Design a protein around this ligand. Structure first.
Ligand SMILES: Cn1c(N)nc2c(ncn2[C@@H]2O[C@H](CO)[C@@H](O)[C@H]2O)c1=O
Ligand SMILES: Cn1c(N)nc2c(ncn2[C@@H]2O[C@H](CO)[C@@H](O)[C@H]2O)c1=O
Ligand SMILES: [Zn+2]
Ligand SMILES: [Zn+2]
Lengths: 157, 157
């Protein structure tokens, strides 16, 4: 189930790259085992540098549920959330985060060195409380492979 | 002119709390002394926990200028930006940040203990690049007073 939803976030990353919507990033929000939102990076579609996949998923899931907190849902991210997205995950009060690729995989292919301390556990003023799971095995290999497979198929941002 | 745009952000904070749009926060984005966007927190109005003042202003300024980078623009925040909003400001490529009140001023009236390590220089992984100015003098006084004056008018969300 973790694997099913992480793979769907990865698939969203591929879809969004193929549509020219944005970069190779997807995110899926589920309530128990029911998909609430499934999104990819929309920075180029919306002309909106905040429209990362996680932020997009959070906005859509709060709209679908008519409330500004998601304490009963979990989020699956094809890549390690950046500082903006991890902050949005804190404010959204999602109860769990599962992510596939380490940020280093995205950095290696042209993106910024832009890593969230609170996620890695080196925050001082920003302390996370949500449960965090870095995928291993096949999930990790799938997520890491996204950046090799899409290496020169999208405009950087 | 720093004072002018900062007090415009303070007035946006008051306006939004009075319309019920969200909490007492405002942000103004400016391009060579021309105001590109003037917004306040819209979390309640939009049912969106990411719709802080700064993020909302970044969305609007980018839509207006037809680009995803505001490298020639500056942002005035009535209150010190939270981790999400500092992440957004970095992603937007804004040239300069000027903020009024320290985050403790918001926390004193019940807001989340939620401070951006990269803004205060306390991170291991996330470093900041942009010019940052904490206002002082009469601007800082008016900005800090917003939360004590506001207390009555909105319910913390
Ligand atoms: C969803 N999503 C995520 N998760 N990350 C992105 C995105 N766009 C650029 N990035 C970069 O990825 C690194 C962070 O890991 C940083 O360089 C960020 O700038 C994006 O849409
Ligand atoms: C614009 N804006 C800002 N700047 N901060 C906000 C907002 N809504 C809640 N907060 C809280 O303020 C502290 C951060 O300084 C944290 O407690 C945050 O949760 C908001 O819309
Ligand atoms: Zn992000
Ligand atoms: Zn914020």
């Amino acid at each position: 189930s973790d694997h099913k939803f992480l793979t769907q976030a990865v698939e969203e990353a591929y879809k969004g790259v193929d549509c020219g919507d944005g970069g190779p990033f997807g995110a899926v929000i589920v309530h128990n085992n029911e998909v609430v939102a499934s999104c990819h990076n929309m920075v180029l579609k919306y002309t909106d540098p905040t429209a990362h996949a996680e932020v997009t998923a959070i906005r859509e899931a709060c709209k679908k549920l008519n409330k500004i907190e998601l304490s009963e849902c979990e989020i699956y991210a094809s890549c390690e959330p950046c500082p903006m997205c991890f902050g949005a995950i804190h404010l959204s009060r999602l109860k769990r985060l599962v992510y596939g690729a380490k940020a280093e995989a995205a950095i290696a292919i042209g993106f910024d060195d832009f890593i969230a301390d609170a996620l890695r556990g080196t925050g001082v003023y920003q302390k996370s409380s949500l449960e965090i799971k870095k995928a291993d095995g096949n999930g990790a290999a799938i997520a890491e492979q996204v950046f090799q497979n899409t290496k020169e198929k999208f405009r950087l941002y």
